[PDB]
Amino acid sequence: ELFTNNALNLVIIFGSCAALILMSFWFRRGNRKRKGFLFHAVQFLIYTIIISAVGSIINYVIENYKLKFITPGVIDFICTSLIAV
Amino acid sequence: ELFTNNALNLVIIFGSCAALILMSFWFRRGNRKRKGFLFHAVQFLIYTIIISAVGSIINYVIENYKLKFITPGVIDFICTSLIAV
């Protein structure tokens, strides 16, 4: 659905939009338009936040529609692999 | 509700008021109007007490009205992150 899916998503779905806003701010770089070290650190941090939110997003999808065969072990393994990469 | 919610809150809700009184006392600084080291330590301690009380406060909210989708793991992660910050 659309309204029911949005209601069940709670703030997990809005995490992607918040992270997009944060990425736009980092493109503006906030206080000063610079990059190096800490900039990459905070970018990696909010990417990890993106993946953490996506974990709950996909956790709700197979819980509110159908369990199917996702076996969330594999998706958390994939998320850890992406974080490592 | 108002009366039922207050009765179910017990002393967890009053923890915020007690901490506000303690913060006012620390602004008065009790024995002597000074700051440094131990002052920041006790302030951090009573902030941690604030967050610990808020944990039970929000634990009762979704237990007495509706479980919803809070997943208290994320809120305790957030509280630990705030304490670290």
Swiss-Prot record, chains A, B:
Coiled coil: none annotated. It is found in: Cell inner membrane. The chain crosses the membrane at residues 7-27, 38-58. Residues 1-6, 59-74 are periplasmic. Residues 28-37 are cytoplasmic. Belongs to the MscS (TC 1.A.23) family. Homoheptamer. Mechanosensitive channel that protects cells against hypoosmotic stress when highly overexpressed. This is Low conductance mechanosensitive channel YnaI. It comes from Escherichia coli (strain K12). The gene is ynaI. The chain holds residues 4 to 88 of 343 of the full protein.
